[PDB]
Amino acid sequence: MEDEAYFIAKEILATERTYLKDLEVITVWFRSVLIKEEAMPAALMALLFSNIDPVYEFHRGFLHEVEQRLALWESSAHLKGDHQRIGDILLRNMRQLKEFTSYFQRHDEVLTELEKATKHCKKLEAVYKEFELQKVCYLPLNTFLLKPVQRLVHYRLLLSRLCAHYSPGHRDYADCHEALKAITEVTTELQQSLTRLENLQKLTELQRDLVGVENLIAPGREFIREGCLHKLTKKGLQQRMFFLFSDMLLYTSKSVTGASHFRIRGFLPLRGMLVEESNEWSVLHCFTIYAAQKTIVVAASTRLEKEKWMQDLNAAIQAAKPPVLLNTTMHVCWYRNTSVSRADHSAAVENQLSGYLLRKNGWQKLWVVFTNFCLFFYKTHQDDYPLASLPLLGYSVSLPRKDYVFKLQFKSHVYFFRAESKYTFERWMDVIKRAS
């Protein structure tokens, strides 16, 4: 009962702790590198930092107010009272956060300008490159420019979740609804900006990752799904990479010894193709893609995988009724024969989570972060780089066969984790299930 409301508070904390460290990848670490190298024109430095710094200020103050209250929580008997309550802190900052919306609206403009600056300036591209290599850069650099607006959502989500196990009679009930309504209209205003950014980000990433392809980023192209399938060739079924956008189908070329597995071979426009499910090819889970002037047959790793790629193709071909010219997620797909949809991203993002838990040779306490379908391992809540990582596509959360332990299974790889509480136990295996 009362415990459930407290663990949400701690949830807000741990995640805010990770958020502030996320922001520090830019405002601390990336900043210095730009100064030491001065490959970034001052206009872009202003545009970048005039819009992240002020946000970072607020949050640093906010984390303080939180973790303090959280300390006064678990306190005398004639005061607590207002020690076991957080709706007041939230209500304040929420109605105070709305004043930063103007800053957020330009994140689509910062991710945009960095890109052009990177391509037209050769020195900055080099700098940018080496910096994404550093252990501090545990996710792609672009991914961080996203988190500010995404964080706004996470308050809406968490505040929502508080009004769930709350009812009239609690001191912190009237405040939360005012707070929730305050953040809900904050996210509303930027909901358009958010989706526009989340997509620009994915296109701007792929643009880099893939070799050969140019002009992939466009005001129109939305990303449907990326993933791995076996193209039918004269030598046999061969693994290849497919990237389905709203207006074409990108696929990967023949694998050469020592070359990239992510060189784009050609695209197949969506006007006007048909996909037709395959004969005794049914067991092979293959279907056939008749394009306007090329035709391919292709096998899915499993049956559901096929139905996904098909349903997504067909529904995308109907919906389409400068010219493209010729261990992240894309890599985890190549090594596990799977795919990830635009729908999955929004389900690994809404399911982000930080916390402390143990990991059985011999129970080992680590601080774990779950973003981007991947677990990141720290020894302290305060380190600036992950000690280890573990991507989770194709991992299944079950109980074994201590107390309150869940296990991750994948082929021969078996890991075990323990949470302190029992609520926080049902929450960890929850989010991992919702990013799978």
UniProtKB/Swiss-Prot annotation:
Tell me which residues make up the DH domain.
Answer: 4-193
Which residues does the UniProt record annotate as the domain PH?
222-318, 350-436
* UniProt note on tissues of expression: Detected in adult brain, lung and testis. Detected in embryonic hippocampus and brain cortex.
Entry's induction text: Up-regulated by TNFSF11.
Q: Which domain of life is it from?
A: Eukaryota
**Function in brief:** Functions as a guanine nucleotide exchange factor that activates RAC1. May have relatively low activity. Plays a role in the response to class 3 semaphorins and remodeling of the actin cytoskeleton. Plays a role in TNFSF11-mediated osteoclast differentiation, especially in podosome rearrangement and reorganization of the actin cytoskeleton. Regulates the activation of ITGB3, integrin signaling and cell adhesion.
Q: What is known of its domains?
A: Intramolecular interaction between the DH domain and the PH domains can stabilize the protein in an autoinhibited conformation.
On assembly, the entry states: Interacts with PLXNA1. Interaction with PLXNA1 or PIP5K1C lowers its guanine nucleotide exchange activity. Dissociates from PLXNA1 when SEMA3A binds to the receptor. Interacts with PIP5K1C via its FERM domain. The interaction with PIP5K1C is enhanced by SEMA3A binding. Interacts with RAC1.
Q: Could you tell me what this protein is called?
A: FERM, ARHGEF and pleckstrin domain-containing protein 2
**Native organism:** Mus musculus
Q: Which gene encodes it?
A: Farp2
State which stretch of the full-length protein is shown. Answer: 536 to 1026 of 1065
